[PDB]
Amino acid sequence: TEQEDVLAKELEDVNKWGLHVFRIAELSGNRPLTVIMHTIFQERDLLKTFKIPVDTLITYLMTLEDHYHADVAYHNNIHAADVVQSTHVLLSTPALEAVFTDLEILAAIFASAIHDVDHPGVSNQFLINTNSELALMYNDSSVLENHHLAVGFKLLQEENCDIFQNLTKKQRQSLRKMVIDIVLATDMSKHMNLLADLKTMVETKKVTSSGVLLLDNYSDRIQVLQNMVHCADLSNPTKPLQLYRQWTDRIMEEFFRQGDRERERGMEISPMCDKHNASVEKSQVGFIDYIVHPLWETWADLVHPDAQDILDTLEDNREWYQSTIP
Amino acid sequence: TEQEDVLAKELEDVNKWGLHVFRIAELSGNRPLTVIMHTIFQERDLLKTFKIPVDTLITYLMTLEDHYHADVAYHNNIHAADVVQSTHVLLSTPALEAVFTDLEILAAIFASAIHDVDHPGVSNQFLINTNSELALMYNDSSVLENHHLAVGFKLLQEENCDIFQNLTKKQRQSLRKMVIDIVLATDMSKHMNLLADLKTMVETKKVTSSGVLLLDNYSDRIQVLQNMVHCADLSNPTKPLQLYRQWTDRIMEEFFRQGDRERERGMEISPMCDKHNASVEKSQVGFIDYIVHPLWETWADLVHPDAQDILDTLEDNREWYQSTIP
Ligand SMILES: CCc1oc2ccccc2c1C(=O)c1cc(Br)c(O)c(Br)c1
Ligand SMILES: CCc1oc2ccccc2c1C(=O)c1cc(Br)c(O)c(Br)c1
Ligand SMILES: [Mg+2]
Numbered sequence: 001t002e003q004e005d006v007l008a009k010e011l012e013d014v015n016k017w018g019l020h021v022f023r024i025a026e027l028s029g030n031r032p033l034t035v036i037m038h039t040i041f042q043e044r045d046l047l048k049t050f051k052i053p054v055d056t057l058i059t060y061l062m063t064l065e066d067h068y069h070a071d072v073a074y075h076n077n078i079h080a081a082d083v084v085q086s087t088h089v090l091l092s093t094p095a096l097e098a099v100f101t102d103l104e105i106l107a108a109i110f111a112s113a114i115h116d117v118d119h120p121g122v123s124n125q126f127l128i129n130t131n132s133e134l135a136l137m138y139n140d141s142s143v144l145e146n147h148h149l150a151v152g153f154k155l156l157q158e159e160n161c162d163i164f165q166n167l168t169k170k171q172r173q174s175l176r177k178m179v180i181d182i183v184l185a186t187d188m189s190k191h192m193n194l195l196a197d198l199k200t201m202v203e204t205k206k207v208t209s210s211g212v213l214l215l216d217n218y219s220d221r222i223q224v225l226q227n228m229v230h231c232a233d234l235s236n237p238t239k240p241l242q243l244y245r246q247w248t249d250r251i252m253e254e255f256f257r258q259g260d261r262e263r264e265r266g267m268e269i270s271p272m273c274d275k276h277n278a279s280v281e282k283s284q285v286g287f288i289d290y291i292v293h294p295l296w297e298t299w300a301d302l303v304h305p306d307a308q309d310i311l312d313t314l315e316d317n318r319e320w321y322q323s324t325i326p
Numbered sequence: 327t328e329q330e331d332v333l334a335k336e337l338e339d340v341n342k343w344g345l346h347v348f349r350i351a352e353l354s355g356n357r358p359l360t361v362i363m364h365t366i367f368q369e370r371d372l373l374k375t376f377k378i379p380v381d382t383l384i385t386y387l388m389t390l391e392d393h394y395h396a397d398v399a400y401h402n403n404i405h406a407a408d409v410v411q412s413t414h415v416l417l418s419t420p421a422l423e424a425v426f427t428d429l430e431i432l433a434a435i436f437a438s439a440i441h442d443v444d445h446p447g448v449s450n451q452f453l454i455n456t457n458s459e460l461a462l463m464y465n466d467s468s469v470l471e472n473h474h475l476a477v478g479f480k481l482l483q484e485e486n487c488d489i490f491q492n493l494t495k496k497q498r499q500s501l502r503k504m505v506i507d508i509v510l511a512t513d514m515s516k517h518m519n520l521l522a523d524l525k526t527m528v529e530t531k532k533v534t535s536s537g538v539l540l541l542d543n544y545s546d547r548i549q550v551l552q553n554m555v556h557c558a559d560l561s562n563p564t565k566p567l568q569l570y571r572q573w574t575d576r577i578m579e580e581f582f583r584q585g586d587r588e589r590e591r592g593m594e595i596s597p598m599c600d601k602h603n604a605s606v607e608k609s610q611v612g613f614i615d616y617i618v619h620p621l622w623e624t625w626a627d628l629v630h631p632d633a634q635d636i637l638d639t640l641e642d643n644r645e646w647y648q649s650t651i652p
């Protein structure tokens with residue numbers, strides 16, 4: 001039973017950027033989402049604040065984890081655990097201390113946990129172009145993200161899975177709306193608009209006397225939580241390289257498998273999905289330069305200087321992937 | 327068998343506001359959606375422009391009509407026909423003569439036919455507040471309208487129902503996007519924004535010297551079609567009084583039935599849904615004053631003055647309903 005002692009020792013880094021999430025996945029018996037969510041809920045005293053029975057929390061978490069696909073290389077329960085833990089660290093940043101309520105914290109962590117549930121390993125555009133049942137259900141609009149939300153909420157109805165059973169009716173209504181707004185913002189088709197609003201908030205930033213962010217309306221509060229979970233979703237290149245490279249190996253396997261399906265169907269191969277003509281290194285550099293660095297540099301400005309070490313690791317990782325090209 | 331010749335002479339005025347849809351409904355064996363769509367398809371020469379096997383048109387329209395509930399007093403197949411024919415007439419507006427292409431004409435017409443399919447007779451807010459499966463599926467966002475679209479498209483996958491089988495893949499993709507954008511605009515939560523975009527467009531109206539409208543970008547074009555089918559959706563108070571009064575008796579039955587369900591479940595009663603405290607007549611005047619007339623007067627200005635007759639009839643029916651108030 002000393003393996004549980006090793007897992008508990010690793011869980012002490014749950015407040016740290018760069019958690020060994022793949023080792024925790026191994027040490028916990030492929031339950032990184034459950035043990036990391038449980039650990040975070042204890043750390044933030046969320047089981048007592050919202051009167052969540054321990055058995056119900058574990059039962060939902062194991063059920064939610066179950067509905068991530070173990071046979072998809074990237075969008076699986078490890079990624080969900082990683083986004084959960086990354087959002088947890090971002091919530092603890094000094095520029096946001098006491099800024100969000102316990103319900104908003106609960107919503108952002110819950111949203112992170114469910115944000116990719118039941119992901120089949122193919123993109124929205126693939127599901128649209130192949131006339132999938134999901135794209136038909138959701139009228140080609142945020143197809144996956146609507147599905148993730150629907151599954152995440154529906155699993156609360158399985159027996160002893162309603163972790164929100166002791167929230168008031170107004171608490172559940174408020175949380176549900178916030179979770180929906182947050183997970184829908186993980187659709188990359190919303191990235192440019194989400195970042196434009198984040199830049200506007202940085203340019204017009206307001207700070208209280210305590211030194212923390214001033215967010216006095218739902219629109220600004222939910223936009224920060226949306227971008228926070230979005231940043232955590234796109235946090236792989238900001239992590240220590242040995243973690244970043246495994247995430248890159250995993251997403252490229254998922255892309256190549258999609259491209260092979262686009263080839264078996266006589267379709268145009270999606271960018272970076274043709275394993276016969278893809279540059280993994282050049283795609284990561286372009287992903288950082290055009291998407292990840294603009295986002296994280298903007299977030300770093302919002303919480304300046306709390307995120308400087310994360311931004312430094314991103315720029316180091318970009319310099320490294322660049323060096324592998326020549 | 328004398329009804330078919332009776333059914334024939336009513337359809338002759340399919341190009342006129344005030345079609346005897348209820349007579350057409352009864353004269354057709356409760357199949358007004360089928361016979362009104364077909365008559366309009368022949369009038370606008372749509373079966374030849376898009377190569378649609380007329381037998382496939384009938385098989386889908388009957389399948390589509392069957393998925394409208396027979397036990398709902400308003401949101402059924404008769405409403406679906408009336409919106410179709412009203413949209414058809416708004417398309418023949420002189421200031422909009424050939425402004426929209428053939429595919430954009432087919433888009434607004436097909437969208438009208440499916441825009442309320444499988445409606446359960448209760449509102450989005452009822453479905454949301456009762457934790458319905460529909461609201462769970464669609465994350466409380468345009469619940470009914472997303473469903474209408476999903477059903478209307480799903481039925482095309484039935485035997486000999488793909489009425490768009492001979493459209494090019496680009497035509498089908500363009501038709502799908504416009505149908506979605508149009509039916510989603512029938513959600514009343516989008517009314518004010520839709521009206522506002524109609525307000526700003528009026529202030530920036532650019533026309534010929536024969537007066538007709540000039541729409542260049544897709545955004546301006548789709549907004550006109552959205553506000554058009556929305557205008558047809560809310561065209562009851564602009565019809566002849568005998569038609570308007572029948573639609574009012576039906577929608578108030580549907581409202582009262584929802585309010586009774588809101589009571590036997592113990593929830594707050596939606597406005598105008600409490601039969602023990604409803605003023606049907608006052609509700610109609612207020613519905614015209616705050617929703618129907620501001621929409622149709624903004625529409626009239628954009629089409630100055632081809633909608634003066636519709637605007638006059640609406641003001642007449644508003645005056646009559648007001649007179650019914652003691
Ligand atoms: C669309 C542009 C883009 O190009 C890449 C190349 C490598 C890795 C990620 C990306 C990427 C993303 O923004 C992205 C974001 C999310 Br969220 C995903 O779930 C996936 Br999949 C991809
Ligand atoms: C929300 C205010 C309102 O009050 C009314 C009173 C009588 C009739 C219609 C309405 C009405 C609508 O806007 C409306 C619009 C559509 Br579309 C419907 O499918 C239904 Br149902 C109602
Ligand atoms: Mg996702």
Ligand SMILES: [Mg+2]
Nearest residue numbers: 441442470512
């Ligand atoms: Mg409707």
Ligand SMILES: [Zn+2]
Nearest residue numbers: 079115116233
């Ligand atoms: Zn993700």
Ligand SMILES: [Zn+2]
Nearest residue numbers: 405441442559
């Ligand atoms: Zn309608």
